Amino acid sequence: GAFLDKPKMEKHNAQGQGNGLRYGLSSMQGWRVEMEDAHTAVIGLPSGLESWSFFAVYDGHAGSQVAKYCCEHLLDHITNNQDFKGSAGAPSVENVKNGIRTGFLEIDEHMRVMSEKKHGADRSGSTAVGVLISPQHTYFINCGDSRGLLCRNRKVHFFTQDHKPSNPLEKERIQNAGGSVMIQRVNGSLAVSRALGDFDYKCVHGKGPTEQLVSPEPEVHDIERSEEDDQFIILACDGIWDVMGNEELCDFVRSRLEVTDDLEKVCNEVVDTCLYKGSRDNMSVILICFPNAPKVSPEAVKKEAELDKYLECRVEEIIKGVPDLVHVMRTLASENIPSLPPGGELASKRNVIEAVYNRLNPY
Numbered sequence: 001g002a003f004l005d006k007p008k009m010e011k012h013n014a015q016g017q018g019n020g021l022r023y024g025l026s027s028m029q030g031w032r033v034e035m036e037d038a039h040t041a042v043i044g045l046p047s048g049l050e051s052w053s054f055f056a057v058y059d060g061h062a063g064s065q066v067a068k069y070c071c072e073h074l075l076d077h078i079t080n081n082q083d084f085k086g087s088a089g090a091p092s093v094e095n096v097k098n099g100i101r102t103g104f105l106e107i108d109e110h111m112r113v114m115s116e117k118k119h120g121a122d123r124s125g126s127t128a129v130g131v132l133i134s135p136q137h138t139y140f141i142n143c144g145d146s147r148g149l150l151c152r153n154r155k156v157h158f159f160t161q162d163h164k165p166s167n168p169l170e171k172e173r174i175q176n177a178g179g180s181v182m183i184q185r186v187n188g189s190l191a192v193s194r195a196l197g198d199f200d201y202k203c204v205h206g207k208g209p210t211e212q213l214v215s216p217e218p219e220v221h222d223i224e225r226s227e228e229d230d231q232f233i234i235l236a237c238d239g240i241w242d243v244m245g246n247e248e249l250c251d252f253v254r255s256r257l258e259v260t261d262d263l264e265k266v267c268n269e270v271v272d273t274c275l276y277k278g279s280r281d282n283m284s285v286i287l288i289c290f291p292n293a294p295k296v297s298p299e300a301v302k303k304e305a306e307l308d309k310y311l312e313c314r315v316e317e318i319i320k321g322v323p324d325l326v327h328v329m330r331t332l333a334s335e336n337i338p339s340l341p342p343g344g345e346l347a348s349k350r351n352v353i354e355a356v357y358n359r360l361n362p363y
């Protein structure tokens, strides 16, 4: 509803390891007056799914309630229904997919009844993007305009398709539910076509839960795992994707992993880079690395130290009536400095430039 006068740049982090996985995450409120993102990150699932893992980002809209509920309860709604637990043995691919769909519909209905019964005043909604990782499969899950991708063999192997109201099938559903897409928005208001919550958009008489103006139905994609070739998974809200493309962010993350194995720090760098690229939204990123993720390179670390020192010297010489940081950044940009991080560019080096600037002009 409003912007802060200065961004809240404080990072909240988590990290972990297990089942042959390493992960880090970072979330940051940014320019927004409230933090309405949430996330789930768990290696080892209950009830015979110890070798399974689950990661998810939730981008809350008009409040954090739906997102916060999801982040604590979506997983059990997915795994603790009859469709997921279908077969006698390990869940089949269909069990997993049907189980995920049922879990989204059932948590949505659960929240709706909780809200009706307790006379809930919030009209919040949430996206969800995540991965359910088994020994042999990565199941991508998407509902909304948060986004996930898989980097395999140094390339974007897969990314989720954002649910935008102007997408043909989304637009069709909206119109069949009595609504319209005005520019990019449901009835000129809502920027997503799919979400949990947003119950005001789920009141069309004579249409099922998945045929409302806004649908809680997730899209699920089974990717068979590749032990040799799988590198990393990125999950993030639109606060990240609004200012960095799939290949850019994939290239950027690779460049950062070649310099560090600290996954929280890599996530911090993504979020700061997007802030400095002009993102004014809440930002959350989860980075899940597989055994063959890029490795720290002695040469990359050396190039990074050389670049940092170079930037430090440039700031000094530009300072020489001292220019402010905005103007220093502008001057550095006009220098077309080579060997900046792919995708991240000068924005990804701002913390280094600003720390230099502060040392030289501390007042």
Ligand SMILES: [Mn+2]
Residues within 6 Å of the ligand: 036, 037, 059, 060, 061, 062, 282
């Ligand atoms: Mn939000």
Ligand SMILES: [Mn+2]
Residues within 6 Å of the ligand: 059, 237, 238, 239, 281, 282
């Ligand atoms: Mn957002």
